[PDB]
Amino acid sequence: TSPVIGTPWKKLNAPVSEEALEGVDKYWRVANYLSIGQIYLRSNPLMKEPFTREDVKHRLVGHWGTTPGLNFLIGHINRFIADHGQNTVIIMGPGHGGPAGTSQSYLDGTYTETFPKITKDEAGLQKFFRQFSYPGGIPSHFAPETPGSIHEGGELGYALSHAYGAIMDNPSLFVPAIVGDGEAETGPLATGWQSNKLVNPRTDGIVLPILHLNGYKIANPTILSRISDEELHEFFHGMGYEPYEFVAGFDDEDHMSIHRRFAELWETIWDEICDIKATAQTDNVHRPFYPMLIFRTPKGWTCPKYIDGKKTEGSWRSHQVPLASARDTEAHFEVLKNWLESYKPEELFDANGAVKDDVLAFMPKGELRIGANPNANGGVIRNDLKLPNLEDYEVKEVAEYGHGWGQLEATRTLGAYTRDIIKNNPRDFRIFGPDETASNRLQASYEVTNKQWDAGYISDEVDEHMHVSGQVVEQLSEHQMEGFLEAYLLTGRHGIWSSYESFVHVIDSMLNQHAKWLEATVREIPWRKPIASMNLLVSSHVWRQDHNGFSHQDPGVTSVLLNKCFHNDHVIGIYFATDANMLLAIAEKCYKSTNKINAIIAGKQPAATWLTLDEARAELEKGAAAWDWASTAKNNDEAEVVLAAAGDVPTQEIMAASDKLKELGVKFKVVNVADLLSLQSAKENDEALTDEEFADIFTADKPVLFAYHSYAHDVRGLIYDRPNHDNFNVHGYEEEGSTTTPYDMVRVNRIDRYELTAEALRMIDADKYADKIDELEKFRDEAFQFAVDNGYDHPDYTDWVYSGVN
Amino acid sequence: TSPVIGTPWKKLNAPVSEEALEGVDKYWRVANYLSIGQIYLRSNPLMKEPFTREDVKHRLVGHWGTTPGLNFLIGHINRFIADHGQNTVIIMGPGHGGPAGTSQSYLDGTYTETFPKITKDEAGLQKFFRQFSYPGGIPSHFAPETPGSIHEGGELGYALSHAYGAIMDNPSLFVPAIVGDGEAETGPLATGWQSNKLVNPRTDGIVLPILHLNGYKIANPTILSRISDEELHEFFHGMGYEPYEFVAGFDDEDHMSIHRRFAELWETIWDEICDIKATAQTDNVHRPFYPMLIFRTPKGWTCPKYIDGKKTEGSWRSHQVPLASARDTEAHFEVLKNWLESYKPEELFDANGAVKDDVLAFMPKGELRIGANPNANGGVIRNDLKLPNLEDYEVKEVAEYGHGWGQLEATRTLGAYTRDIIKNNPRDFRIFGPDETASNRLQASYEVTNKQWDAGYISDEVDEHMHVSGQVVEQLSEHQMEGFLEAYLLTGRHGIWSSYESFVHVIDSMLNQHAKWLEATVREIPWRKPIASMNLLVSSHVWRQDHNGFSHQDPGVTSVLLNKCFHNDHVIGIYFATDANMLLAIAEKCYKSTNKINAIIAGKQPAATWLTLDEARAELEKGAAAWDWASTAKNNDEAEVVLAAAGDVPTQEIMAASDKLKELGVKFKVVNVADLLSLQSAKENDEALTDEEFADIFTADKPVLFAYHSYAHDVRGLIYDRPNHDNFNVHGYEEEGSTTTPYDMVRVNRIDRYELTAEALRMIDADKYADKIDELEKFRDEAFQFAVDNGYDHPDYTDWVYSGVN
Ligand SMILES: Cc1ncc(C[n+]2csc(CCOP(=O)(O)OP(=O)(O)O)c2C)c(N)n1
Ligand SMILES: Cc1ncc(C[n+]2csc(CCOP(=O)(O)OP(=O)(O)O)c2C)c(N)n1
Ligand SMILES: [Mg+2]
Ligand SMILES: [Mg+2]
């Protein structure tokens, strides 16, 4: 449960004191000085004479175009938090403005507790300057290593979705989301603007989107800054926002006047926020107009105006680093020296190098600090879910009528399980889906909650199961759901989100970024506590896209996911749900897990059920297991072939092929691989099953016929080192598909039961079984011709049921 | 060069005749009848008695929620084209409305020329009805098999970028881009709205975005339809559009009145289009307000109102298929029969089943038809580029001073080459880049063209190289560039686009879709002529992300790309530019190629040059080649190890390791793999090099040490079948990185020269070379400590130059 901190939504009811604004100005100066020292300095932080080119870093790496504006905003936000005691977490959308965040963490004090070696004196200042973007130091971007960070910012376009996710079910949290004007050009952010139609002011917090309209991208102006101001205000007001505009730094106005003006504007916007919050207590049915700030400043606002006769301040030339070589020429070093002295550090630092007390006297303290805020470190907030007992949802007909019984839809069991999880954990668990929950048969959750929808309502005939507050969020944008869920987990909550398989690639970048957030966390960041796992239910897979066809059949998500399994981080888990019971075991494991990305591939089509819950759990605790009941060989030596499968449709095809093989006297073994990553090399992955266990499951001499869900490429690239890998004959998706009957789909990919039977015969004796192979190959064509002639699959294919059903 | 067709931008200067609107109404009726027959009917197309449940398809597959609105729009657009003779290509954003497009193709006649077996009579009508979404038929979506299609519509959010790309450098082309309201929620489309700031009305065509605001997604209402109309108009006017609104079908108004009203509204919008075009001839500096149409209609507009007491028309329940089982119950069959008879097909079809002449008397003819428009079939327009002679750009210092000379930046040579290509081919070649052309060192193109930018201008100090018309387009959105380039190629033009490596994943979906467009084209669509290849210059790769760090280091693009190499389609090419000359050869091959996706991975960092242009061409014509000069073994038998590399940084590390090995007397071979797909299995890929050639390059017994750019997983999954695959020891990216010196980057991934030397020693004799291995492993740590202490890489690492430089 998200905690309430301080006194949320209080109006100041007084003008901002002059001492507070003096503190803000001194903070801005000292923060800019630290941001410059990090990029350029390495030694002699206080410029004690002699200050020479020796003290400049050899390789100048970093960004400065956005840093001073971020320092300005952060200083004013710090004054605001100190005055009001608001629960605040800052989303820094331009993550390349890393020095701003690191400077804030150093100034508020949190960086010293987090890293004790960086003291608050001259030596600590020297280390702090040196370590930025340094070999063995800290990253340039606003990184997980930085206290008070929940958004990396490497990628662009996910600041707004992250802010809105952070405020969901968090009524007392205020999130100022700083957005780069160039970042606003990205596709994800343009639809993230429209995310105020899915949050309720009473049940959720408040997001204040601060558009950092500095004018330029890297070597390019931004579209937003160059269109007319009337167009900008009209555009923002068309998306349910009330635009306020602040303009500074474009003339010779004194800095203290700028601080006064921003104080007044900020207090006005805060008054509208408090009015919205107070209104939401009584009326929360009709959507308000959330204010948003348009912050127009020159890029690299405080840097020297001209360098080599080139306009630097207020241009794109200041994005990465002005003074690209301040160590190679004397004129550049003099420019840098004057730039550093312009902030007058002699009055900002005491004799010992500590920032003077009166500079930070206005700073917030305790839990209120951005660095120490719990919503930044979502691990400490996180509490484990209350999970319903699993046997309540087990499919018991398997244990009575035998394996392979029925035509159940696999995902409905997960739907019921998640419904009861929501029932036990309201306001703490949430389901996302890009318009596809009902298609993924997860609608069982609607019995205990509603779809959160804050746009207009028209009629009851079409608005079933929607409400202003709910635990289900839908919007046709995978970026929205991914960002929402990542932010939701990063703040300490839990959730799951489901999608079509081919469309998960839309968020291939996003997943990667989260993986990078986890890999960085597990390796070198002990103080960042574990967060809940990100659960992605991939459904409506390639093998059953009847209505859509070729455009919707892309199983390549696994190929992307495997790229992130290195160095025993275990941040990735890929699970294949053979049936409903296997799905239950997988989901239970995933919901108990932490610091992982769990992709559960389950089909929504009517499929048989093979395992009991105990059997499924036993298979899952190893990752792959031999089905003793399905096999005909009592020992490894007897088997003439091993049929291994991963995925529901491949499992069905393998079992159907096994039935035909059993009529021919073939001794074969049957293996099901629930978890893909268990097949990884033992010495590479300690959690992966050992080579001895692998050899026990797959005998060395016996050929192995593997039927796989995704492309065979990723499996073959995974088992290269394993014993008997050369005998594996993997059959996977082969980029063949259309709108056609289910038998045709598996036929054109050579994964059907008849082709699998012919393959298993060929690994034994093509010469002995030549006639049978000819008959099977003829029958494939005859069955396809039957589907063409009569419009549906063959009675042989459709009516087939396993011989073990009682 | 894009041709001029008909009489572009003519005002009608007369009211629409009543006979034309009668024709439009009859067209709408017959098109809806055909769309229903495709989804439901299997036989007896004209409902000749007896009409029973036998004639209904067993498996009802398709979409109807968007079909009638598309039929309405297409009928009115057809009347418009017939009246004005405009050059028009329709982008159908809701691609799931396939029956609309197929019905249009059948009605205008083009489908009969394209597929002669589908005659225009009762038997042809029966075949046309049966083949939709059928085994051995045609896909459900608006597919490449459908004449007059350039956008699949499978994925959502790329209609606007495709339209804007289609109109670039096409002054006479008018593109009505139909956009689904649910599709407008997607991230790519929200930023595609802002694409009118990058097109010039004089030099480009006109896009008319038709927002198909039918209200609902699948089982969910849309955000756009539920916000207030004032908000909608304000939002669209804030993005430089003039919104016109049409509302129909929500009451009992007669259909003919709806047709009259839409005729008047369409003519008004066309008058504003013609005014904009006429103005652009004299003044094209200031941006106009392009009109856009908001088309509010009930979803599944003409279907029965209620089915099972559930609101079907005007709801989300009609998205895929109303009457989900019209074959299983008599009441459902009666509902379907009445639905079919409501269109009165008895007067729309003659005795022989041909659509009556007076129904299509208003139709356009010849090249003007949407099916027969050349801009739909971009292959016939396409003409080969005028390529400058290659030796003009060869780096000649290699042939004089020896291999490995210099510190040139690889991509600058490509910059000069593309500059001269633009010079020879203006208005036909175009460069795209998500704000990264100057970072990718492609700015040499600015000497002959400008960045196209139609937003406001402020000053010359910051607006260098921008102009209202240019051959370079920049906007911080990879979706924009990918869609622009795909549409540009699909209409017959050529282009290239460059990007950071980690961010190509942002368009992982888009690439896949284009691959699907190509694979479908090469296999079964002969009448679709080849289009220009899509060239993606991947630069600023993982090994040299000094400023950004861990967030920007993701080489997984190759893993996605390999998933699309099946069945000898050869739609994918991955090339690794070792140096400038190799890059020139690669680019020449790519620019001459057709129907491919070519990913050229070249580094922007200062790197040595190894090959002459003839040598690079010789290596490229095989894909992998043995460097005879670098090797020490004259024959395959002598070598104790083979050092193979793919990529510039891996090549540098391999050569540096070879220099250290040569001092120890080791006989080794050196191999460079320019093209990855040449390593694919010979029997799988006919273009891939044979197993005999592979064995010649890599001897069977000798161990092979492979240094790879991307993850080792994809390489190992590619060479499973090849001889001596078990001896390969691939070293690739291992998810280790930060902001640090270049030596550290390759050190933490165990791909540096010292680790490679130790590895190559270990494949020979760990026991003999134990002391040398210990010394190398100590030296790695000492060199990293030097970088930590002094801030830059070791003099041993930095100052090293190949021993073959004269
Ligand atoms: C999708 C994407 N494309 C490109 C980049 C490379 N990049 C890093 S920072 C940056 C510029 C950011 O522009 P803007 O939003 O204007 O930021 P600011 O001016 O505040 O630095 C770019 C393009 C990226 N991070 N993400
Ligand atoms: C990114 C993405 N997510 C999901 C889908 C699945 N899908 C196919 S059609 C469709 C509904 C389209 O909605 P809308 O734009 O309102 O279309 P219309 O009402 O005209 O059918 C969806 C969600 C998709 N094609 N692309
Ligand atoms: Mg900016
Ligand atoms: Mg719609």
Author numbering:
A (entry chain B), B (entry chain A): 2 to 807
Please, what does the article write about this entry?
Phosphoketolase (XPK) belongs to the transketolase family, a member of thiamine pyrophosphate (TPP)-dependent enzyme superfamily. It converts F6P, xylulose-5-phosphate (Xu5P) or sedoheptulose-7-phosphate (S7P), which are intermediates in RuBP regeneration, to produce acetyl phosphate (AcP) and C3, C4 or C5 sugar phosphates. XPK is an enzyme present in many microorganisms, primarily involved in substrate-level phosphorylation to produce AcP.
On the other hand, Bifidobacterium longum XPK showed no inhibition by ATP. Comparison between the C-terminal interfaces of free SeXPK and free B. longum XPK structures provides a structural basis for the lack of ATP inhibition in B. longum XPK.
